Each structure stands twice: as C-alpha cells, then as structure tokens.
Design an enzyme around this catalytic site. Sequence first.
Site, PDB file in Angstrom:
ATOM      1  CB  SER A  69      32.379  44.512  49.984  1.00 43.23           C
ATOM      2  OG  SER A  69      32.616  44.675  48.591  1.00 43.23           O
ATOM      3  CE  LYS A 115      30.086  47.944  48.668  1.00 45.60           C
ATOM      4  NZ  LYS A 115      31.427  47.326  48.520  1.00 45.60           N
ATOM      5  CE1 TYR A 123      27.650  45.139  47.464  1.00 47.42           C
ATOM      6  CE2 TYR A 123      29.053  43.733  46.133  1.00 47.42           C
ATOM      7  CZ  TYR A 123      28.823  44.434  47.298  1.00 47.42           C
ATOM      8  OH  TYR A 123      29.758  44.424  48.311  1.00 47.42           O
ATOM      9  CD  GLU A 137      24.531  40.485  51.560  1.00 44.49           C
ATOM     10  OE1 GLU A 137      24.678  39.292  51.902  1.00 44.49           O
ATOM     11  OE2 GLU A 137      25.103  40.959  50.548  1.00 44.49           O
ATOM     12  CE  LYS A 164      28.603  43.789  51.842  1.00 46.57           C
ATOM     13  NZ  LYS A 164      29.236  42.750  50.975  1.00 46.57           N
ATOM     14  CB  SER A 221      37.091  39.792  48.362  1.00 42.79           C
ATOM     15  OG  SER A 221      36.296  38.703  48.818  1.00 42.79           O
TER      16      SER A 221
HETATM   17  B1  LIG Z   1      33.171  43.566  47.840  1.00 43.38           B
HETATM   18  O1  LIG Z   1      34.286  43.152  48.490  1.00 43.38           O
HETATM   19  O2  LIG Z   1      32.647  42.410  47.382  1.00 43.38           O
HETATM   20  P1  LIG Z   1      31.523  41.369  47.998  1.00 43.38           P
HETATM   21  O3  LIG Z   1      30.968  40.542  46.923  1.00 43.38           O
HETATM   22  O4  LIG Z   1      30.334  42.211  48.754  1.00 43.38           O
HETATM   23  O5  LIG Z   1      32.111  40.348  48.869  1.00 43.38           O
HETATM   24  C1  LIG Z   1      33.602  44.308  46.498  1.00 43.38           C
HETATM   25  C2  LIG Z   1      32.432  44.276  45.513  1.00 43.38           C
HETATM   26  C3  LIG Z   1      32.567  43.181  44.448  1.00 43.38           C
HETATM   27  N1  LIG Z   1      34.717  43.655  45.814  1.00 43.38           N
HETATM   28  S1  LIG Z   1      35.776  44.482  44.734  1.00 43.38           S
HETATM   29  O6  LIG Z   1      35.144  45.227  43.575  1.00 43.38           O
HETATM   30  O7  LIG Z   1      36.586  43.479  44.027  1.00 43.38           O
HETATM   31  C4  LIG Z   1      36.887  45.473  45.778  1.00 43.38           C
HETATM   32  C5  LIG Z   1      38.078  46.000  44.975  1.00 43.38           C
HETATM   33  C6  LIG Z   1      37.848  46.880  43.929  1.00 43.38           C
HETATM   34  C7  LIG Z   1      38.907  47.373  43.189  1.00 43.38           C
HETATM   35  C8  LIG Z   1      40.197  46.990  43.502  1.00 43.38           C
HETATM   36  C9  LIG Z   1      40.434  46.112  44.547  1.00 43.38           C
HETATM   37  C10 LIG Z   1      41.879  45.722  44.860  1.00 43.38           C
HETATM   38  O8  LIG Z   1      42.131  44.763  45.614  1.00 43.38           O
HETATM   39  O9  LIG Z   1      42.835  46.375  44.362  1.00 43.38           O
HETATM   40  C11 LIG Z   1      39.372  45.616  45.289  1.00 43.38           C
END
Ligand SMILES: *[B@@]([O])(OP([O])([O])=O)[C]([C][C])[N]S(=O)(=O)[C]C1=[C][C]=[C]C(C([O])=O)=[C]1
Length: 360
Positions: free
Chosen positions: A64, A67, A150, A273, A313, A316
Amino acid sequence: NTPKDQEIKKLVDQNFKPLLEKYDVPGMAVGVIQNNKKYEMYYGLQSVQDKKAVNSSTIFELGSVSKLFTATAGGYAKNKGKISFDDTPGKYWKELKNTPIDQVNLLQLATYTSGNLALQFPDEVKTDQQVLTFFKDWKPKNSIGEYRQYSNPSIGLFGKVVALSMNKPFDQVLEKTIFPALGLKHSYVNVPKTQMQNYAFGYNQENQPIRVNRGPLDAAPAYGVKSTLPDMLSFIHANLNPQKYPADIQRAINETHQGRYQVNTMYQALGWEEFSYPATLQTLLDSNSEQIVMKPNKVTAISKEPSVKMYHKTGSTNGFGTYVVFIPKENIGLVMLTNKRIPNEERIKAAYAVLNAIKK
Ligand SMILES: *[B@@]([O])(OP([O])([O])=O)[C]([C][C])[N]S(=O)(=O)[C]C1=[C][C]=[C]C(C([O])=O)=[C]1
C-alpha cells in the site's frame, strides 16, 4: 564519544533487529535520513535458498505504500492542469458517464470517501472489462463524501483516471515521468528481466518463498510498486525538501502533504496519513486499528490545521512489509522494508523508538 552513524546503527539494532528473530523474517532494510544525511542498514537474506544478502540493490514490494506514488502522480497531473480534484471519473473514462460512480469526485476516490467501495477488488475481477463492469455496477450506499472506508479499488480508479489524463498507461506515468522527476533509479511497476536477480523473494507465514501475483492491472496504483532502500530514502528526501525539486514535482509533493479531513487524531492527506507533531505512540497505533482500517468512519472537517506535523504510511503484500515515516521540522525520516510481513504495530513502535532517541 560515538560517531552519529554508529549511534543510529545501534538504535536500529536495538529496535528493529530483534524483529527478525521474533517473527522469523529472512531479510530487512532500514534507512534513516537526518539533515540530508542518509544511513542504510541491511540485515539477513533477500533469498534464503540462494544465501543472497539483503543489500542496496535489493528490490522489495511496497504494498500500500505504492499509494504514495499514485498520490504524487495525481498531484503532478493536477498542477499541470490535466485534472481537477473536483472532476468526476466519467470525464476521463467515458464508459463511466451516466453511472452512479460518476457522481464521486477524484479527491473522494483518492481519499476513500465514495461511500461504497470495499477494501479489495473481488477475486473474480481480473480483466479490464471486469473492472469496467465492477465500476458500472457500483451503486452508492452511504452519502458520498461522508464516510472513510479504506479501499484499493477507490485509489485504483483514481490512478487509472490520472493516467488517462496524461495519455499514458499508469506504469508509464510512474516509470517515465514520476520516478525520474523524484530521482529514483531502481523503482518499478514491472521489474525488468535485468533486475530479477535483485528482486527479493517474499516469504509467507510458513517461510515459503512467494511473490505478488497481483490482480487486475488497475490495482497497480494501489499496491503494484517495487523499490530499493536507497530509492525510498530518496523519496523521503523529496518529501522533506520539496523546494529542491522542479516546480511540477514540487507542487505534486506539496499536494500529497495537504490534509483533507480528519478521523479523530488522523488527518487524511493524499496517500499519506498526517498527524500533529509530536504525536503520541497511541495516535500512530490508532491509525492502523481495525476500526480505522477495516470499518467505515464518519469524516470531519479539519479544525486544527497542524503547523508542525508528521506523516506515515504502512504497506504490505503477502510476502513483504513496508513502513515509511517523516517529520519535516525535525528534518528526519525512516523507511523499513522486509521480505516477510510483521504486525503493523511493531513497525510503528520500532520506528517511534528510533526516531525519538536519535540526537537532534
Ligand atoms: B495495504 O498494503 O495495506 P495497509 O493496511 O495500508 O498497510 C493494502 C491494503 C490492505 N494491503 S493488501 O490488500 O493486502 C495488498 C495486496 C492485495 C492483493 C494481493 C496481494 C498479494 O500479495 O498478492 C497484496
């Protein structure tokens, strides 16, 4: 007594290094920038099976934290006059004209207040036509602009529209315009074959090597960026010193620093943020609570426009963790990259300990 580089290294050893054993993390990179001096610390392995050490060339998935680059790209397009944040997406993606989503403006997409966009695209949404169908079938729930939820599709749509307004694919917007303007040399949406040897394996919770296989193309503005520790330190440098950059990207960076609304002690800027500085540890932890991340919350207008502020920020993917934080009036920032997820609270706590103990 002890040189500054050693003092910072000792503080990172005391606060970040124990996380590798605690959470069985193969590799970690931690960078600190203070007063335009950069300090880089590398631990562990980018590939366990290859016995390849984490180093300045190691490429990590930002999750994330991607972003932040989408936000910067939107600020760039806005200050070139290619978009207005009061515009709606149908102005640029014409198949969305006369649809409910075309009532939501670009700022509301970028800051998660459309009123009915969930955290992720559905798994079945994979092709460009399925994404178009997903947004055409969108109907409002909450009043638009009233609630923050979010959402990766929300900022995914924002990034797609930004790219349309610049007449290039989003990957090209970052790789040919924004990354060069910020001075980044090893940041990618698509890692090229010549860099695969530097792309870390991610590691799942069974310590098996994996890597992001992503979803639709229009999810890349939400979580599709990969970068190195030197490049993320340069990005922090740009956020700490926008006045050193050309006007277009300087105005873009400043756009991402502007708080737009509050949820309790959080200010939602573009991507970042934002918090009044000094921030209590609990203020920073609250920004990552289930209530804020996973539920809708009513937004309120900014009352105290913080003069002295900080930004952070988390990000993951399945096999990677990231945390970036910076504090303009202390001229300091920190980046953590890992090739295994660890709890967000531990990232925040360790960075808080380091940043508060570094001698001014
Ligand atoms: B982002 O990284 O998360 P925050 O909470 O801002 O630290 C994002 C939003 C939750 N995370 S996510 O949805 O898990 C990114 C993601 C989405 C789909 C697939 C994969 C992957 O690793 O294959 C990661």
